[PDB]
Amino acid sequence: ASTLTVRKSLSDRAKARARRQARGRKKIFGTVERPRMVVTRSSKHVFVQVIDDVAGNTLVSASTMEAELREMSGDKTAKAARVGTIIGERAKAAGITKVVFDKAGNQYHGRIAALADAAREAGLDF
Amino acid sequence: MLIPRRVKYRKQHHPKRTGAAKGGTQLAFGDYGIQATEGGYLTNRQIEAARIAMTRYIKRGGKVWINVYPDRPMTKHPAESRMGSGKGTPEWWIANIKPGRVLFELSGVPEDVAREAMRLAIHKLPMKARFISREG
Amino acid sequence: ASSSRNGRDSNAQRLGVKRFGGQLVNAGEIIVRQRGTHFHPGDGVGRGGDDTLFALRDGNVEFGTRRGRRVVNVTPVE
Amino acid sequence: MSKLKITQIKSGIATKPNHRETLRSLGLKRIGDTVIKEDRPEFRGMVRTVRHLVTMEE
Amino acid sequence: DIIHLKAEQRTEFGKGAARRIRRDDKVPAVMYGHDHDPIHVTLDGHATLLALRTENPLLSIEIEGQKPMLALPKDVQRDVLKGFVRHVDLLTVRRGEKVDVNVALRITGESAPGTIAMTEFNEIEVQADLLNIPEVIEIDVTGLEAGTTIYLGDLKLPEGTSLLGDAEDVAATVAFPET
RNA sequence: UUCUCCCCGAAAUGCAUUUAGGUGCAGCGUUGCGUGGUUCUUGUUGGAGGUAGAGCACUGGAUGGUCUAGGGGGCUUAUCGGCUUACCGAAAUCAGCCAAACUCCGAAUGCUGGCAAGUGUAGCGUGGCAGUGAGACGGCGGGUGAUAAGCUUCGUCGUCGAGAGGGAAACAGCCCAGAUCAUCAGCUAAGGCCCCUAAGUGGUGACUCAGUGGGAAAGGAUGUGGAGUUGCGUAGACAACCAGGAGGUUGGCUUGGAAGCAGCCAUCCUUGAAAGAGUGCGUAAUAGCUCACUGGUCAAGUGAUUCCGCGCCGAUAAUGUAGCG
RNA sequence: GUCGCCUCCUAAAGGGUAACGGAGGCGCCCAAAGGUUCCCUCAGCCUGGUUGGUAAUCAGGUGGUGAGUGUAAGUGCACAA
RNA sequence: GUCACUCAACGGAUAAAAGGUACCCCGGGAUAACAGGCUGAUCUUGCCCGAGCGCUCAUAGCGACGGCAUGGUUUGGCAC
RNA sequence: UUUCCGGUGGCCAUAGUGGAAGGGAAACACCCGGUCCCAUUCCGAACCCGGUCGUUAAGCCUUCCAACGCUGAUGGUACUGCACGAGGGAUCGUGUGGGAGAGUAAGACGCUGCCGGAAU
Numbered sequence A: 001a002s003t004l005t006v007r008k009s010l011s012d013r014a015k016a017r018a019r020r021q022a023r024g025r026k027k028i029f030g031t032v033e034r035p036r037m038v039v040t041r042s043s044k045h046v047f048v049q050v051i052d053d054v055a056g057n058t059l060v061s062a063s064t065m066e067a068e069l070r071e072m073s074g075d076k077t078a079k080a081a082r083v084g085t086i087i088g089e090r091a092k093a094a095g096i097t098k099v100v101f102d103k104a105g106n107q108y109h110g111r112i113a114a115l116a117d118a119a120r121e122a123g124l125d126f
Numbered sequence B: 001m002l003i004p005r006r007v008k009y010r011k012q013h014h015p016k017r018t019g020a021a022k023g024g025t026q027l028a029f030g031d032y033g034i035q036a037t038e039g040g041y042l043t044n045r046q047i048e049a050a051r052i053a054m055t056r057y058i059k060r061g062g063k064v065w066i067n068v069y070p071d072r073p074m075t076k077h078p079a080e081s082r083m084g085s086g087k088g089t090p091e092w093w094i095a096n097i098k099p100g101r102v103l104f105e106l107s108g109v110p111e112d113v114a115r116e117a118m119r120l121a122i123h124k125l126p127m128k129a130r131f132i133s134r135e136g
Numbered sequence C: 001a002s003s004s005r006n007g008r009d010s011n012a013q014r015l016g017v018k019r020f021g022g023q024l025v026n027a028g029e030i031i032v033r034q035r036g037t038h039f040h041p042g043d044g045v046g047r048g049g050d051d052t053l054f055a056l057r058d059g060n061v062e063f064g065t066r067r068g069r070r071v072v073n074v075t076p077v078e
Numbered sequence D: 001m002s003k004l005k006i007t008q009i010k011s012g013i014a015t016k017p018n019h020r021e022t023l024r025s026l027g028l029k030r031i032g033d034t035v036i037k038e039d040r041p042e043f044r045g046m047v048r049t050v051r052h053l054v055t056m057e058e
Numbered sequence E: 001d002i003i004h005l006k007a008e009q010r011t012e013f014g015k016g017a018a019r020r021i022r023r024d025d026k027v028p029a030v031m032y033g034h035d036h037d038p039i040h041v042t043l044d045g046h047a048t049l050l051a052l053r054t055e056n057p058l059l060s061i062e063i064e065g066q067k068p069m070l071a072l073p074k075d076v077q078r079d080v081l082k083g084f085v086r087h088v089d090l091l092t093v094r095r096g097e098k099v100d101v102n103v104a105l106r107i108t109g110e111s112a113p114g115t116i117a118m119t120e121f122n123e124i125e126v127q128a129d130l131l132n133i134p135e136v137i138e139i140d141v142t143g144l145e146a147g148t149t150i151y152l153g154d155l156k157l158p159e160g161t162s163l164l165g166d167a168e169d170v171a172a173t174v175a176f177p178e179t
Numbered sequence F: 001u002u003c004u005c006c007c008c009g010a011a012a013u014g015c016a017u018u019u020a021g022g023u024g025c026a027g028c029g030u031u032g033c034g035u036g037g038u039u040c041u042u043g044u045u046g047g048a049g050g051u052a053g054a055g056c057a058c059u060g061g062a063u064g065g066u067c068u069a070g071g072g073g074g075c076u077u078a079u080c081g082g083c084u085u086a087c088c089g090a091a092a093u094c095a096g097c098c099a100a101a102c103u104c105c106g107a108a109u110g111c112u113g114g115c116a117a118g119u120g121u122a123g124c125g126u127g128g129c130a131g132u133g134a135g136a137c138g139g140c141g142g143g144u145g146a147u148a149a150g151c152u153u154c155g156u157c158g159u160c161g162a163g164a165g166g167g168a169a170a171c172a173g174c175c176c177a178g179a180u181c182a183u184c185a186g187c188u189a190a191g192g193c194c195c196c197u198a199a200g201u202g203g204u205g206a207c208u209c210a211g212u213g214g215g216a217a218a219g220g221a222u223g224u225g226g227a228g229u230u231g232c233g234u235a236g237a238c239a240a241c242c243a244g245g246a247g248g249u250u251g252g253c254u255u256g257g258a259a260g261c262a263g264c265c266a267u268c269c270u271u272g273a274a275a276g277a278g279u280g281c282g283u284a285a286u287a288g289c290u291c292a293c294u295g296g297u298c299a300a301g302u303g304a305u306u307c308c309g310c311g312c313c314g315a316u317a318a319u320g321u322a323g324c325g
Numbered sequence G: 001g002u003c004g005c006c007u008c009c010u011a012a013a014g015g016g017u018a019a020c021g022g023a024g025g026c027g028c029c030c031a032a033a034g035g036u037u038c039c040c041u042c043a044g045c046c047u048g049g050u051u052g053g054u055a056a057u058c059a060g061g062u063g064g065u066g067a068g069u070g071u072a073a074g075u076g077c078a079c080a081a
Numbered sequence H: 001g002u003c004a005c006u007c008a009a010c011g012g013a014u015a016a017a018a019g020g021u022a023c024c025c026c027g028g029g030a031u032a033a034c035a036g037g038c039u040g041a042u043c044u045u046g047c048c049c050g051a052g053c054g055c056u057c058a059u060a061g062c063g064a065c066g067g068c069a070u071g072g073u074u075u076g077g078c079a080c
Numbered sequence I: 001u002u003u004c005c006g007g008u009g010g011c012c013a014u015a016g017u018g019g020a021a022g023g024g025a026a027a028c029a030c031c032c033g034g035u036c037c038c039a040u041u042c043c044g045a046a047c048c049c050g051g052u053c054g055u056u057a058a059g060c061c062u063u064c065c066a067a068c069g070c071u072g073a074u075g076g077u078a079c080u081g082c083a084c085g086a087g088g089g090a091u092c093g094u095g096u097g098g099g100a101g102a103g104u105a106a107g108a109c110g111c112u113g114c115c116g117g118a119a120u
């Protein structure tokens, strides 16, 4: 469900983040050569999906909701770094090589930046 | 005299005189009407003459509506001049009338005096017109 | 007498669609000359400095809609 | 396929060039000349393009 | 009262077919409803003219093969200059069901000689029943003058005919003479 | 600017021009060589559109209604404030509208691709030789001009140009039709068939009486034939002929006279089978003749209104009938 | 009076199309008003508030483009150009 | 590589140029003056409606505001 | 497999605007702080970071309402390619093809793909 118009009655943070995400998606698009790495950052978790936007289907994904990461002791940024390592490992497992990173309306800073740097350490060409 | 407060363009092409009435073919204000059965250009002086005829016959009873406004400027070439050297200045204001257009409406007056007043008004217009009513 | 105070018109610019839907084009072929983006660049179509839309690759021209935008695509030839 | 029989009854002079090329495409050369065509939509379209110039039978 | 109209099936469509039908002293009509597809018929011209003399008449369309059908003429395309009916829209109706219609307006009041009364609408929206279609709705304005106005919220409506349209607009106006 | 025949066969457009009646290049002709269906027509299947039409969503224009912020004029009287808001009234809203330079819409065509069939022999590349670059009229869509011009300027198709034959009386441009030659054969097109003048003073059914046919407007009219709607009518309809055809009341602002006819008005009542404070004639002013209506002999249809076909008037220059040849 | 260029209409929904046809502009400007990256949403209306009033500045609601765009007009741009 | 043109009559005759001719002189009806032709704004001659004037009374005589035409002797438009 | 829900697309109002009621298991969200990375043309409002306490009040989600808005036939009409015809003229009509806009009946309180969570 993606209506081109930002639905009214949304909260202020939601409206602002929706505008920022729509502006980020103007230049970012996932193909088979370079799929899009979208990081959805909420107050508790980070959910990463690598998407081929031509077919509209996610190739690999990772989160802090997985079984082997609920019990892992660390900080929000440390958990995001572990998620970045995992998503890089899964991308190498599926043969992704290079991705285009999408911050999904958030600032490239902190948890998202740690996730991206960890994915770069894993072997992702971005 | 009906002249618009202002027009966007004072020099305009001649209005099309082709086709039946686009709108205003049914009575909407009064109880009787003058319906044009022919097309043409209805100037503001003819509209005024017809209005005076109706208003003077019906005297004090009822209201008269002019459904057509002369907001189309028609230019005039400088007199005794050859052709060219631009378009002339507006001289006449017209309404573009098509067959079936209700020109004037009349109400608050019985049918015979209404018929006579609208006969008087119709004898002022340059096209053919007829008396119409709301099916009695 | 008098004179005409008009009389100036610019030269014809010959804008408009040059390649219509389903037409086979080479890479770099101009699909439409236009002022502004009445058509937007789609997939395999680039936009020029004067808003000219050109083919970025070989294939067939198609006109369509992407989100809210009216776009021109060049679908690669099978 | 009833094998349309098309005969030219009027001349091509002063007709639209479309009509003259339609007459040429039907194989008609003179007034009174006749051709037999298969009952196919293109020949029927040609016949109805120049129906004021030809007559058609089966 | 129910006016019976003989109809027969229409199978040729277009401006030419309608022209031929109207040259044969007939009227094209389409009859649509709720539980059937639209049925295209052609009616006698003069009988249809007499039946459509009145407004909102209950018509019984009689087609030889099929059963009779009840209808109300919802749209009547008449010639503007002449009076001939050019096309009839027939909305099929049920006996045990309401109908929305447009009932007519007239003034039958007699104010002071100086002041005059006017009607500001042609027909008004009314929900009523089949066998009871009011002919008109009268507004009597006798001795009511000056800037009195009449809106659609307080009218002596007949039984079984509720009010549907917005009751916040005027239908009659009494005022001084024209100055 | 001088002999012949055979085949093909234009242009009067675009751009530029000390250019505009000249010329260059391009377009259109021809021809050698090359390449061959690439062209064209129709069908079918896609594509972009913003014209016609329509609409009022925007921008302007606009008619009426509801309601109202605010201006005008006055008042008790104004420092307010109230009585007005019966005048004006932005905007808001309801209803009907208008637009080449308005568009929430939106054709047919045209243009451009794919495919299929048909098809004259079309199209394309490259060389030799050009002429043309004053166009005209007609149909359709427009601008200028006045709803003008056999006007002017565009778009498109046709013809003339450069095209004979047949028709249009004659009559480049209109209609039919494109002449290789001969024919004292036939069938046809447009157009025609009483005679000029080839073929029907053709058959059948209607209409016209104006020589309409064989020119024209607003408008006027018991011409005529036909088809609807509606009022009165043997409880007796309309016209004609016999009696009540008038009371209070010379109802009022007039006007020496408006008593029924100067005009405007509330536009009644009565002896009563019956009548209008008044419709024509008459009339200085009043009288009066006589109209709508009531009974009688008679008595079978009369009165409006809408539309349609063909006609009438309006109609109107100067050598001679003279607007069917 | 005009002569080159640009925008719109005439121009008949591809492109082109004339008249001493109808409207306007240009012969610049900007070292940022260019490049890139990131963020933001306007005009108008309503209400509350010192100077302050219709309109400086602040606060809340509403408002999707009617604001804006260096400069004519048209095509665009609120995903903002 | 860059510079020098209101070469603006903007494809830009010369680096460099205004007038008179009634003293004039040597293709076009492609183009004006007369006349003819077309048109008919203007002109002209009529008419339609009838506000109102005529003591009263639209129409004896008139005839506002409007509308429709004739003629082709006016001034023009076109340029055959 | 299914149900519900959190993200991420496609169609871009049949989806929206408005109203009424209800729900939070994981998730979402408000929320609590500002020490730390980071920030406000002032403000931890926002951006950013540490938590997940409290709360479903709003966002979000489920259901109901045609109310405003949106979608919308059939038939007819306008218009129109080609072929004709009529009028003194503005202009009009027919044959043969194509055929709206408005309006009416009506639809509609979204459809759908991938990833994940909880239960099954």
Ligand SMILES: CCC[C@@H]1C[C@@H](C(=O)N[C@@H]([C@H]2O[C@H](SC)[C@H](O)[C@@H](O)[C@H]2O)[C@H](C)Cl)N(C)C1
Residues within 6 Å of the ligand: H033, H034
């Ligand atoms: C206003 C006059 C118009 C022109 C006058 C005429 C013309 O050329 N006339 C000539 C005139 O000259 C002599 S008579 C003096 C000739 O004998 C005569 O045939 C004619 O040619 C002179 C100019 Cl007057 N043209 C034919 C038309």
Ligand SMILES: [Mg+2]
Residues within 6 Å of the ligand: B023
């Ligand atoms: Mg309307």
Ligand SMILES: [Mg+2]
Residues within 6 Å of the ligand: C048, C049, C050
């Ligand atoms: Mg650029």
Ligand SMILES: [Mg+2]
Residues within 6 Å of the ligand: C049
């Ligand atoms: Mg540039």
Ligand SMILES: [Mg+2]
Residues within 6 Å of the ligand: none
């Ligand atoms: Mg030849």
Ligand SMILES: [Mg+2]
Residues within 6 Å of the ligand: F020
């Ligand atoms: Mg030349």
Ligand SMILES: [Mg+2]
Residues within 6 Å of the ligand: none
């Ligand atoms: Mg040459």
Ligand SMILES: [Mg+2]
Residues within 6 Å of the ligand: none
């Ligand atoms: Mg139009």
Ligand SMILES: [Mg+2]
Residues within 6 Å of the ligand: none
């Ligand atoms: Mg020339």
Ligand SMILES: [Mg+2]
Residues within 6 Å of the ligand: none
């Ligand atoms: Mg020409």
Ligand SMILES: [Mg+2]
Residues within 6 Å of the ligand: none
């Ligand atoms: Mg021509």
Ligand SMILES: [Mg+2]
Residues within 6 Å of the ligand: none
């Ligand atoms: Mg000419």
Ligand SMILES: [Mg+2]
Residues within 6 Å of the ligand: F163
């Ligand atoms: Mg020729």
Ligand SMILES: [Mg+2]
Residues within 6 Å of the ligand: none
């Ligand atoms: Mg000839």
Ligand SMILES: [Mg+2]
Residues within 6 Å of the ligand: none
């Ligand atoms: Mg002859």
Ligand SMILES: [Mg+2]
Residues within 6 Å of the ligand: none
């Ligand atoms: Mg030959």
